[PDB]
């Protein structure tokens, strides 16, 4: 049962009514499902930046959206999709950030998952980021109503970060060290 995490009830229902209104003006039809390609134009044209080329958009969100293979679309594809990037207004911002750290750390992340570093997010609960480390698993969480301006990510504990890479600086995925421990910051 697709839900997102790491949320309050009430967050819950606001997000799922957000998913609802952006599904509704993409395919004007509450439920039900569309073609593939007409769900990522949609939301391309919807989601990009004004400066953003609808093209890149198109294949960004191709990409994000696994798998390539289906042919079609539903709600809860747009819940998914809104839950590990969202809100909307910031969605690419957030895409882009996160993306880039994977990009300089291996390729770690996945959206379509089928020693070394793993990450990908949680099909059940959608803005859970799920971490395979050599200590083990992690998860964090992508908080859906809140833009990529504010602390949009929080933790088991309820401690948020700002963003992405500041999260993946406090915590990253020995070296003979010559420093007393309180010269530490």
Not at 56 to 80: F, H
Not at 155 to 182: Q, R, V
Request: with cysteine; proline share 6%.
């Amino acid at each position: 049962s697709m839900c997102i995490g790491n949320s309050t009830p009430n967050e819950q229902e606001t997000f799922r009514a957000k998913v609802d209104e952006i599904w509704f003006r993409l395919t004007q039809k509450t439920d039900g499902t569309v073609m593939r390609d007409f769900l990522i134009e949609k939301a391309a044209e919807y989601f990009k930046q004004p400066e953003q080329p609808k093209q890149n958009a198109i294949e960004v969100i191709s990409a994000i959206m696994a798998p390539q293979e289906e042919q079609t679309k539903s709600k809860a594809d747009l819940y998914k999709f809104l839950a590990m990037f969202g809100p909307y207004e910031t969605i690419m911002l957030k895409i882009a950030s996160l993306l880039l750290i994977s990009n300089n750390k291996g390729h770690w992340l996945t959206f379509d998952p089928q020693d070394s570093i793993s990450g990908w997010f949680d099909q059940n609960e959608p803005n859970c980021l799920i971490l395979k480390t050599p200590t083990g698993i992690r998860k964090i969480w992508n908080k859906p109503l809140i833009e990529a301006t504010g602390q949009y990510l929080m933790d088991e504990n309820g401690e948020k970060y700002d963003s992405w890479d500041k999260y993946f600086e406090m915590k990253p995925i020995a070296y003979p060290t010559f420093a007393p421990m309180h010269h530490h910051h």
